[PDB]
Scaffold this active site. Structure first.
Site, mmCIF file in Angstrom:
data_model
loop_
_atom_site.group_PDB
_atom_site.id
_atom_site.type_symbol
_atom_site.label_atom_id
_atom_site.label_comp_id
_atom_site.label_asym_id
_atom_site.label_seq_id
_atom_site.Cartn_x
_atom_site.Cartn_y
_atom_site.Cartn_z
ATOM 1 N N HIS B 41 0.805 -1.226 0.000
ATOM 2 C CA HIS B 41 0.000 0.000 0.000
ATOM 3 C C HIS B 41 0.842 1.282 0.000
ATOM 4 O O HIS B 41 0.262 2.366 -0.052
ATOM 5 C CB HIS B 41 -1.069 0.019 1.101
ATOM 6 C CG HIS B 41 -0.566 0.134 2.517
ATOM 7 N ND1 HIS B 41 -0.064 1.326 3.016
ATOM 8 C CD2 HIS B 41 -0.612 -0.767 3.524
ATOM 9 C CE1 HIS B 41 0.194 1.108 4.294
ATOM 10 N NE2 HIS B 41 -0.101 -0.142 4.643
ATOM 11 N N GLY B 143 2.625 6.085 10.173
ATOM 12 C CA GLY B 143 4.037 5.994 9.821
ATOM 13 C C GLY B 143 4.682 4.689 10.270
ATOM 14 O O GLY B 143 5.810 4.390 9.878
ATOM 15 N N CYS B 145 3.686 1.622 9.506
ATOM 16 C CA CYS B 145 3.560 0.518 8.549
ATOM 17 C C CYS B 145 4.915 0.068 8.062
ATOM 18 O O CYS B 145 5.820 0.894 7.883
ATOM 19 C CB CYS B 145 2.646 0.899 7.396
ATOM 20 S SG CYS B 145 0.992 1.375 7.930
HETATM 21 O O1 LIG Z 1 -4.155 1.653 8.771
HETATM 22 C C1 LIG Z 1 -3.284 2.314 8.210
HETATM 23 C C2 LIG Z 1 -3.388 2.682 6.742
HETATM 24 C C3 LIG Z 1 -4.259 1.711 5.976
HETATM 25 C C4 LIG Z 1 -5.588 2.007 5.695
HETATM 26 C C5 LIG Z 1 -6.393 1.098 5.022
HETATM 27 C C6 LIG Z 1 -5.888 -0.135 4.635
HETATM 28 C C7 LIG Z 1 -4.572 -0.400 4.919
HETATM 29 F F1 LIG Z 1 -4.059 -1.603 4.554
HETATM 30 C C8 LIG Z 1 -3.744 0.486 5.564
HETATM 31 N N1 LIG Z 1 -2.177 2.786 8.837
HETATM 32 C C9 LIG Z 1 -1.874 2.753 10.221
HETATM 33 C C10 LIG Z 1 -1.267 1.672 10.859
HETATM 34 N N2 LIG Z 1 -1.107 1.545 12.183
HETATM 35 C C11 LIG Z 1 -1.541 2.536 12.950
HETATM 36 C C12 LIG Z 1 -2.163 3.708 12.457
HETATM 37 C C13 LIG Z 1 -2.666 4.733 13.300
HETATM 38 C C14 LIG Z 1 -3.304 5.819 12.769
HETATM 39 C C15 LIG Z 1 -3.453 5.950 11.394
HETATM 40 C C16 LIG Z 1 -2.981 4.989 10.547
HETATM 41 C C17 LIG Z 1 -2.328 3.830 11.047
#
Ligand SMILES: O=C(Cc1cccc(F)c1)Nc1cncc2ccccc12
Ligand SMILES: O=C(Cc1cccc(F)c1)Nc1cncc2ccccc12
Ligand SMILES: [Cl-]
Lengths: 305, 305
Positions: B41, B143, B145
């Protein structure tokens, strides 16, 4: 989101762990630049431990009596000196993995990461707080002496603890990296006991603010308190007194969540009175006191949920 | 003495963390040999995330669209390919810090250390378990990921998790290093939820043995149970079924403490039906399920890496 007991990444410290052997005793040493730091009790036998005269035991040792092993490499000891309860072994090789570092003495309530080691080899990393009674509730077995506690804010390792001993209640005592013990403890096998421990009030408040930041408010109430009335109640539950310094330190978390420090104190007073009634706060059924205000700001989002 | 939630030393993994930028999105990558692994992603904009066609988004990218930064050094991407939900960026430089490693897919109940990273820089290390509902209760901000989960077996890092997303309840979802999600999740901005979770029974039993080894025995009783009666009770409290495999794996702990696994099951049954009655076990008012039988043995024996 989420809130975990989080340790600093241990890599910078792992590259400093060495094994120190003196006679039959083997423990850990911290190799920074050309010096290996370790508990001075590495020179004692079990007999020497009741009333050791370290100056007398040390004067009988030469550089070649200290075997220092860094991985599969034997370091050559070219000097030795004692500073308080730490032995400093000068070696002929500077550690190429020496990070940017400092020696810092911490106060009770401060947290730090512990890299538990055996035979100069890291075994695990966990997060600790220096208890109000100057002990740490670590996880240490025989051979763990010389394992260190540290913080890594930026790329600088601040070494704050070196492990020396386990007290009869299973809690641990050690020194700063200048060899000064935390608390009234001595590196002697004479009867010693940890004093009655108390809860780190400022840390519980920080953790309650972490819970509010993460979305939870069930424990809040419409009340406030004076600082003195809070302390009168808090001390009945064996909580440390909250000082004006603690109130000031909680300012940023108070501003971020919109909850005044004395309003959070009122919630704490109510939690102490009522218990949790089957509820949890950040996955815990007990009030957590091993997160400082600084830890909460570092781990939590800058945007409250 | 002492029992802490302990992570593996993170140094071997820290030397693999890099920053991966594609357009406006920056996240973490794992640099092993000449390949950087990261969530696929990274190529998506917020609109793309609503319904992404990763093959179509990827075909529009060239090697130079991926900026990879290892410390203060820019790595040059010489190839790119997708394997399930992970993007593999071929780089011209093999990571000189690549440890001995394997990619392993873990089962629910298994624990691992997470090295949380932001901008390719490690920020903290914590221990967690793959929940029975395939989520992890991590601590991750935007951030994070690309941060990874791992275990160490001797000198070999077994990478088992790569962070991809946070679910609405604040829990986390990710993949193994082959890009296969743990759980029924997809890497898309669409309605997703963690299923009802259960307690990892074998892990609670392992933690009860750890408490006994640490001198906490108030919960022991004269009773035993059959595996079937235990499973009937455990199902009532949303505990995972205990299998004969679980009973076998706890054999060493049963032998060391003298409490047969079914004898410990009768203690657990009583704790579920009656609670702790104001008492704690290893400083916890809840039954802890994020220590496996192996974690308990390792910590209560001092295994090093
Ligand atoms: O969840 C996502 C982006 C996402 C969205 C939809 C599908 C996905 F595969 C990935 N990132 C994050 C990871 N961990 C913590 C977070 C905390 C706050 C904001 C984002 C965070
Ligand atoms: O306490 C000592 C030795 C000691 C004794 C008296 C004074 C000292 F300065 C040092 N060693 C240990 C340290 N940590 C954990 C342990 C667990 C089990 C057995 C020993 C452990
Ligand atoms: Cl301090």
């Amino acid at each position: 989101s989420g809130f975990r007991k989080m340790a600093f990444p241990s890599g910078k410290v792992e590259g400093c762990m060495v094994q120190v052997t003196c006679g039959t005793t083997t423990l850990n040493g911290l190799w920074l630049d050309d010096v290996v730091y370790c508990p001075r009790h590495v020179i004692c036998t079990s007999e020497d431990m009741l009333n050791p005269n370290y100056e007398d035991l040390l004067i009988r040792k030469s550089n070649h009596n200290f075997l220092v092993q860094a991985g599969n490499v034997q370091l050559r000891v070219i000097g030795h000196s004692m500073q308080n309860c730490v032995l400093k072994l000068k070696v002929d090789t500077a550690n190429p993995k020496t990070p940017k570092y400092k020696f810092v003495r911490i106060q009770p309530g401060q947290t730090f990461s512990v890299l538990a080691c055996y035979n100069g080899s890291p075994s695990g990393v966990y997060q600790c707080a220096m208890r109000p009674n100057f002990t740490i509730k670590g996880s240490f077995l025989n051979g763990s002496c010389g394992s260190v506690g540290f913080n890594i804010d930026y790329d600088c390792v601040s070494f704050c603890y070196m492990h020396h001993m386990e007290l009869p209640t299973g809690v641990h005592a050690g020194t700063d990296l200048e060899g000064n013990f935390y608390g009234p403890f001595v590196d002697r096998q004479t009867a010693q006991a940890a004093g009655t421990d108390t809860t780190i009030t400022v840390n519980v408040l920080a953790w309650l603010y972490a819970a509010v930041i993460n979305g939870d408010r069930w424990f809040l109430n419409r009340f406030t308190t004076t600082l003195n009335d809070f302390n009168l109640v808090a001390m009945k539950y064996n909580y440390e007194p909250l000082t004006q310094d603690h109130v000031d330190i909680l300012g940023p978390l108070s501003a971020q969540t919109g909850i005044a420090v004395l309003d959070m104190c009122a919630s704490l007073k109510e939690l102490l009175q009522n218990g949790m009634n089957g509820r949890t706060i950040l996955g815990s059924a007990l009030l957590e006191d091993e997160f400082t205000p600084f830890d909460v700001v570092r781990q939590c989002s800058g945007v409250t949920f």
